[PDB]
Design a protein around this ligand. Structure first.
Ligand SMILES: Cc1ncsc1-c1ccc(CNC(=O)[C@@H]2C[C@@H](O)CN2C(=O)[C@@H](NC(=O)CO)C(C)(C)C)cc1
Lengths: 104, 141, 87
């Protein structure tokens, strides 16, 4: 089963899918292909939880019925600069304006 | 042009609403006039008696947004095989993002106020030009 | 897979499959691998990308199609973007 994801770090957001059966490490290989950083320089997160390389996306709670094409699940991403890892930082999207009066 | 054939040959059909909308079935009568039929709530079904060669289309009953039936615009009951009814699976299309936005905006703004929206004239006209069966019949002709 | 980068007015960089971005004829024109959108903020462009995923997934598919969700607060801006992008 496909799961649909947003892999997010700072102001970067990757839209992609993966198999529920696929592993965290395999997702780092996907990120590697796109952002040119190897898996050993990546940490992936679900909310605040650091994800283990060997676990499946399904095991980590990314399921086909929660990680949907029209509402994808978020996977946090952090890079290691040299010796140590940055902290997980995901920049929020902008805030919508107030509804015009005629829409209230 | 688009009208039911007056065949008088019964054909039993299941209208199956697999959309999240309230569905208005519309029969095109022998003069091509759209006749509205009772509505189907989301996810419900009705076993109905129709006829071979008759033409049907299906709409959101509240907004008249277009819906698909067996993946297309028009449904024509055919010969029943082994006494089995014909299934008419009614679903949402994949609307364009523009049409879907027009739907949501229409649902929140009264038509008198479309002109008060801060958008280009063509979008005000797009909002005002809401879905309508007659418009589609002319299109489909 | 070929990806492209779509950048919102507030500097959010959205990386999506090239094939998905070509849902928009406007985006296709702007490419001929990054496009900047000076008028589309991230709360709108993120939804645009989700639409691409939704459209590609459910176009020519028999599995029942869910409603594409759009919050009231973003609908007007999303409409404007959709009209620009022709999608
Ligand atoms: C209960 C219901 N919910 C949603 S639609 C519906 C419903 C209700 C009654 C019917 C009864 N069937 C008809 O009215 C069929 C449908 C269409 O094929 C036209 N029709 C006729 O019976 C027509 N008859 C013939 O063509 C006789 O040859 C007349 C009477 C409307 C002219 C069908 C569906």
């Amino acid at each position: 089963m496909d799961v649909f994801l947003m892999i997010r770090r700072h102001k970067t957001t990757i839209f992609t899918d993966a198999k529920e059966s696929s592993t965290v490490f395999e997702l780092k290989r996907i990120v590697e292909g796109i952002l040119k950083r190897p898996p050993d320089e990546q940490r992936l997160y679900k909310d605040d939880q650091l994800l283990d390389d060997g676990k499946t996306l399904g095991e980590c709670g990314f399921t086909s019925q929660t990680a949907r094409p029209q509402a994808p699940a978020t996977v946090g991403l952090a890079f290691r600069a040299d010796d140590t890892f940055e902290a997980l930082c995901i920049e929020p999207f902008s805030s919508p304006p107030e509804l015009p009066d005629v829409m209230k | 042009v688009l009208r039911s054939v007056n065949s008088r040959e019964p054909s039993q059909v299941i209208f199956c609403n697999r959309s999240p909308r309230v569905v208005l079935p519309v029969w095109l009568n022998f003069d091509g006039e759209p006749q509205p039929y009772p509505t189907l709530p989301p996810g419900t079904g009705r076993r109905i008696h129709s006829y071979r060669g008759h033409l049907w289309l299906f709409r959101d009953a509240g907004t008249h947004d277009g819906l698909l039936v067996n993946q297309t615009e028009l449904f024509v009951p055919s010969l029943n095989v082994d006494g089995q009814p014909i299934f008419a699976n009614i679903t949402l299309p994949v609307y364009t993002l523009k049409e879907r936005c027009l739907q949501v905006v229409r649902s929140l703004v009264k038509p008198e106020n479309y002109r008060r929206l801060d958008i280009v004239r063509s979008l005000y006209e797009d909002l005002e030009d809401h879905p309508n069966v007659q418009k589609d019949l002319e299109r489909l002709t | 897979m070929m990806y492209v980068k779509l950048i919102s007015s507030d500097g959010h960089e959205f990386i999506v499959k090239r094939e998905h971005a070509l849902t928009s004829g406007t985006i296709k024109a702007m490419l001929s691998n990054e496009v900047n959108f000076r008028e589309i903020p991230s709360h709108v462009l993120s939804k645009v990308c989700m639409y691409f995923t939704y459209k590609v997934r459910y176009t020519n598919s028999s599995t029942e199609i869910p409603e594409f969700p759009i919050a009231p607060e973003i609908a007007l801006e999303l409409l404007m973007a959709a009209n620009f992008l022709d999608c």
